[PDB]
Write a protein that binds this ligand. Structure first.
Ligand SMILES: SC[C@H]1SC[C@@H]2Nc3ccccc3N21
Ligand SMILES: [Zn+2]
Ligand SMILES: [Zn+2]
Ligand SMILES: [Zn+2]
Length: 231
């Protein structure tokens, strides 16, 4: 029942309810003639919502806000971008114009600026060293170490045992490495180990792209990364 890349036209956004007060948002983009899906997270924080990542571009992110309004009807007050790539910060300027406070680690904000990408306004403190965790409203933010990017964060929702891995975690149907231009291949399996150690109780694991599953997605990603390393 999870929406698949084939059921979402680019420009549209679907929401998928995972648990009481926890949703993923799913959008699509074209790249080099193919269509890719992308996931983010929505978490209810009292009578407000916390958004995790944009919907990969301004147009998708405006549609995301419209779909949240229609389907949930609570205001998005804060948003966190989990690394500096466009599928995480592309749309930050739309969020800001709507009055959403946008957040990222100082590492992410610096890398976005170097890349010419949109820059979240606020800086998250306490995430500079691998293994660092901080609470942010209804979620925990965790820096596992360098992996898909040097700045990547993961997000845990304790009320629902939901682990959002972002692009540090691959879906099971991905058997070859994706965009690894900014990755630390050497550190990636160790960083995954840190996620496993910190959230062994996670019941629902969401990759940055594609279908959710369980904690098997962590070992799966290590397998893919190590195979790429040996390519
Ligand atoms: S992980 C950041 C995203 S934004 C642009 C780049 N190219 C690409 C192609 C397919 C899937 C994902 C991607 N990435
Ligand atoms: Zn990325
Ligand atoms: Zn502000
Ligand atoms: Zn990505």
């Amino acid at each position: 029942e999870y929406p698949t890349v084939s059921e979402i036209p680019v420009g549209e956004v679907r929401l998928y309810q995972i648990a009481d007060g926890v949703w993923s948002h799913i959008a699509t983009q074209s790249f080099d003639g193919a269509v890719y899906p992308s996931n983010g997270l929505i978490v209810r924080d009292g009578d407000e919502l916390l958004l995790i990542d944009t919907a990969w571009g301004a147009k998708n992110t405006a549609a995301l806000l419209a779909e949240i309004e229609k389907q949930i009807g609570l205001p998005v007050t804060r948003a966190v971008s989990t690394h500096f790539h466009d599928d995480r910060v592309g749309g930050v300027d739309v969020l800001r114009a709507a009055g959403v406070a946008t957040y990222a680690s100082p590492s992410t904000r610096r890398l976005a600026e170097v890349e010419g990408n949109e820059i979240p306004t606020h800086s998250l403190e306490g995430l500079s060293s691998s293994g660092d965790a901080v609470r942010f409203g209804p979620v925990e933010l965790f820096y596992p170490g360098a992996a898909h990017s040097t700045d990547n964060l993961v997000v845990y929702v304790p009320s629902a045992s939901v682990l959002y891995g972002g692009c540090a975690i691959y879906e099971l149907s991905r058997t070859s490495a994706g965009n690894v231009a900014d990755a630390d291949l050497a550190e990636w399996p160790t960083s995954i180990e840190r996620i496993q150690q910190h959230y062994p109780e996670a019941q629902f694991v969401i990759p940055g792209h594609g279908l959710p599953g369980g904690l098997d997605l962590l070992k799966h990603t290590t397998n893919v990364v190590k195979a790429h390393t040996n390519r």
